[PDB]
């Protein structure tokens, strides 16, 4: 990168020769089971135009994958996390601004393959009677294949404004018992959605008939640990140094219900059935070069 | 590299042993939702012939993937971004010049694979009646295959000229619902363009019948984050140590139209319908080694 | 990562210009054959706002793969480790908090491929009798394949919280005699579960009809060597500089019962039959920068 | 590799402990639109036999891809670049000599895959009448598949003499509308050359029927950016210390014409229809270690 | 690893700024032909809690692959190494403990790919007489697939206790004359086990009808080179500074007696026929930081 | 890996803060064309236990691939190198010992893949006369695929005893004229061993009908350059500081003869026909740290 312009590697980078006042903050929300951590670093570089501050939103969000409803042996429900989200916003009246919000979006890629073949064949028939036949035919076939990679969960970066930046991880298609994609909105005319259908023509209790959490993706039942980095800059000669931060977590669940139609199991999904969010604003003191919750 | 020409690595580099002053100018265009940033450097190596200046163009352009038209349940229109553009230019009367830029056009490659196959086979026909038959055949086959990668978005570089350099991110073909890829000019005689068609024989409202933004590429919905680097050099003994540089974040949108022909949905696309530009002028002071917006 | 924000690599890291006082603790539980290793380190950085103590949970857990009991020549049982676990709990009364941990859950991945091929063919029929025949045909093919990896054991990170962190390794599935990736849930009406069935139509003694431990995965018999890290931070101005911690090693075994039905061998598996936990308690003295058994 | 001869890595290299007087020169030819750059570094080492000088020739060449003829709706023309050339030469009288250059010609590889197959067949024919028949097959197959990678544009190094070295970027072949690659001299019995043909059986205006520049390779429309390094040496005891050098860019643009034969579009290509040169001259002063012009 | 917890790389490591002793205790057993070497390293870090000691057990073990017995042309025997072993043990009354070791067991992986394809066929049959026909056949396929890599020799670490740690290298399976993998238990009803059967319908002497050692794996006839390592830690404030350690280099052989059944060669394998070990002892003096043979 | 034990990388290595007196000896045996070479290095680290000495017998061995005898057009011979060897030996009564050697036997891996396919088919046949026919069928398929990499020449390490250590290079197999790989023991009843066969039934002279040396592997004709490293350690308190070494570069050839029986060419191989040995004795002076002879 920086070496392509013939510039000495790392010269454009900052933070050299300056001491960094690092720190750490931890908080757990037992109500939502969302272990949130904030790791921050103050890079006060004399050469740089303005002060810098790096925020790491490392933590963990509980999967919360369990059967919430038990209505007899005919049907039962299930709740799983559709998408985890983490955000970061500042009050409008503040003067601090968000500079970078790594990781960013990336351009997808795919492989396209084309094919074209010819053919020529010919055989002679025979038998004891001496009747000899004949046959000569051609053959043509053209086919093209397309291949790509579909992660179960894809991280996305919501439109980052000057005062707020927010990442989000959503649920893509999931392979079940070695079947096809089976995305959130996949529908089957008879069976219906089979996102978490352990058996099709099962006979056990409705609550029992559910895909084992171990078989499913680790995130759904074990939780998602985020690692997003953002840097906010403050003017060097600002009149007021006190500012405010939010660091808002979120987790959108879903509802999955299975009921028996007297012949086979059926399943339906209702997107965004629940929503629980935890927020805790932190206080920044550039003069003290410290962050307190 | 230098090592290959027997020159010790980094010997022909620049910016060694010189102090560098950087900056983190930022700005947000709320109207266009394009959070733009400029991160610059002032490498001033004494050994080099001319003063140097690197202008990073980090930022983000909002996707603006929304359904703007709700004429009724028979038709509806959609607007999506087709190409993000960012460029820098200088007034003609100025003396500064554009030297280099990292992101540059690169050659592409393909894997051509020939094929050839010929075989033979025999046969022996029998039955209880005792008739014996034979058959001798032959076979030939030749085929060709082609393989290459087609990124969803292409990062091409506009014809660069002194005092004006620009970049584009055009929209290449896209794959929806796992079927064949589609592009801007893809046409189908019965269905028409199917770039963002959720279902063929749908029954819901026209506006509702649209490909989910999550399924589509992240850039269209979330946005794009340009990362382009350009370096400007100016004479060491110029009469005036002050130049003005303009930065642009142009975006191009498109209109996607759906209507119920009679039995199936129809898709029409118009190329380059709208366009948004947000130009801001920055002031460069070589003597003070600072950049002001 | 840290270089993407233009920050010099390693600037945000901690532990610089410090004197880390590391240590070690080895304990053996001959009753359960669970070697323990508690390699730790005290990173007391003055720049950082909290004390740190990284705990390495190395060790080894015996596989315990043997025929626990045999009942005649037509019935036998086998105990194998279904899943290991490594929990590092902390008393709720204390003020220390779990800062980070590693490894963590990762997003899975799978490749998707689509195919579309259509061809044409022709034939000409002839014989000595002069009969001439023809045949024109065509065909269309649609095929999509999906491939992904399936590790025998999955390293799942149990839902962490402020005072407790847990890890577990489970049995995803195994390949037996290079035929079929059997798992705990696979069932066959004729033979039943065939996870560890050496032979189908065997005639030897039941206790001798088990898959050789060498053929099976090494972890089942040779044991598993854990490797985890749990950095815990403690306030710098704590009233008392001491915090007891508990590390728990445990494994879960399953009983594999197989018997002869007078025609062929059948096997059944029971999940979570036995559970043995090895608990240890360690006292930590932040003032002394040392933790004792 | 010095490490493979047991010599410590980098010992054979040159340029250690010696200050380098770098520089830069930027010139843009408006008429031809080929923004030229020349990054030069002066390396002199007391240990080396003679002075050195590396002359980068990054620059950049505009694609110049546009329709130039509008005869009517029956025929139209098109000019596109087929070869970018940048060659550096010194006057014959001078004493300075070219020593090394990069990139240089490299060998290309291919993959060969033989094949062989045996086959046996056997079936029994039955029916209600009780007629029983048989069949035996002994088919054999053989096949050779050869695969290689061919870039659209090939970089070549013209025969480097003492006083001049030249590079070329020829147009190997391109892939059009996901069809087999079409070479510059490719021909078809009726359709003709199809290097740039948006539609075969079209009805729009002749000028409109042309492959979109975005679809084609970036180099043709967006221009090509070279990066070639050459080093020239001067005797240390040379009586004169002023050697002139000349750097020449170039561009070869072919002509593509489409005309309608009343049934379908047809195309013809003419090679090397136009040409243009820059022919810039620079003055090198070894005594003062500068290169200005 | 250590950098993912935001800890500067290498901060948690041990052995900095401390002088370390070494040694090359080497002994050879002519009777068993197992070149034994012990490269030990003494580490005494003031910051560390205990005193470390690394025992790298690199050496070599003879393959011992030859025809041990010859009892006529009707049958002949062969001995080959089934599995090598090496392990370190300490007396129970000692106070030193095995701290860590490497290599350790690893989790295997597999690639499972599904498949699904449809089909449609259509043709018209005609002759001079004018008869017409048709076919609208279709087809489906649900083929599976599974591939993995299986080394012929597996290196698995057996359950390491506090006073004993051991490795082994078992024979997984071998490919003979490209006729597929064979293992110690592979059986053929007519030929029997044919792990090292040069020819099926041979006619030469029985001794000569054995697979050439060069064709077989190198380890069988050339030898194995261990590279295992261990760590031993002993409390600095210990009354006794002398400990006795022991090393073993045992090998396990096998018999592959081959006899002719008057029609074709038949091979039988017996598991664990012979065995031999060295069991060298070494003395350690922590005070003097030396190991005595 | 020394870093997988938490030991700082390179801590256990030897050679720090010491001066190594390297050297070189070159001697050529015109009789056998063996450009043997030895590159030694005296390492004596005070922190070590014994003096060290590494011998790198780089050298080089000729190919000697020519037709030794020709007898008209009826038959002709050919001599080629079957195997290269190089070994180091010490006097039996000597005190020095062999410690280590870099190129050592390594385990080999082979891929594996199992395929299972189901199928179904159904078609309807009808003709002009209104006859309607049906056909329903199904099929299953199982497939085992195994692939591995086999080099033409496979380096081996002979059983290293204390006093002598010896490497070896043999001829695994070769691919001729893109046909199936042959080897020394390959036999064909009609043609015979076709390893070095130019044409199956060519009419040229007997001597001319040989595979071109260029087509064959590089080692056979152009020689093989070895690179083997050994380390010798001798106690620092030994009464006698002079040691004697022997170096062998023996090479083994083979005889290949073509025979014209009646129509086609027949080839036979006589393994181990001639052996050439070139042994030179070197002298080591540990006190003076020099190897001269």
Swiss-Prot record, chains A, B, C, D, E, F:
Lineage: Bacteria, Bacillati, Bacillota, Bacilli, Bacillales
Keyword Signal tagged: yes
Function comment: Alpha-toxin binds to the membrane of eukaryotic cells (particularly red blood cells, RBC) forming pores, resulting in hemolysis, with the release of low-molecular weight molecules leading to eventual osmotic RBC lysis. Human RBCs bind much less alpha-toxin than do rabbit RBCs. Heptamer oligomerization and pore formation is required for lytic activity.
Alphabetical UniProt keywords: Cytolysis, Hemolysis, Secreted, Signal, Toxin, Virulence
Stated name of the protein: Alpha-hemolysin
NCBIfam families: hlyII
Family annotation (PROSITE patterns): AEROLYSIN
Any one biological process term the GO annotation gives: cytolysis in another organism
Quaternary structure and interacting proteins, as annotated: Self-assembles to first form a non-lytic oligomeric intermediate, and then, a mushroom-shaped homoheptamer structure of 100 Angstroms in length and up to 100 Angstroms in diameter. Interacts with human ADAM10; this interaction is required for toxin pore formation, disruption of focal adhesions, and hly-mediated cytotoxicity.
Main location per the UniProt record: secreted
Record's subcellular location: Secreted
Gene that specifies this protein: hly
Result of altering residue 259 to I/P/R/S: Nearly wild-type oligomerization, hemolysis and target cell binding
One Pfam family in the UniProt entry: Leukocidin
UniProt comment concerning the protein's domains: The mushroom-shaped heptamer is composed of a cap domain (comprising 7 beta sandwiches and the amino latches of each protomer), 7 rim regions whose protruding strands may interact with the membrane bilayer, and the stem domain (52 Angstroms in length, 26 Angstroms in diameter) which forms the transmembrane pore.
Gene Ontology MF terms: identical protein binding; toxin activity
Keyword rRNA-binding carried by entry: no
GO cellular component, one term: extracellular region
Family (UniProt): Belongs to the aerolysin family.
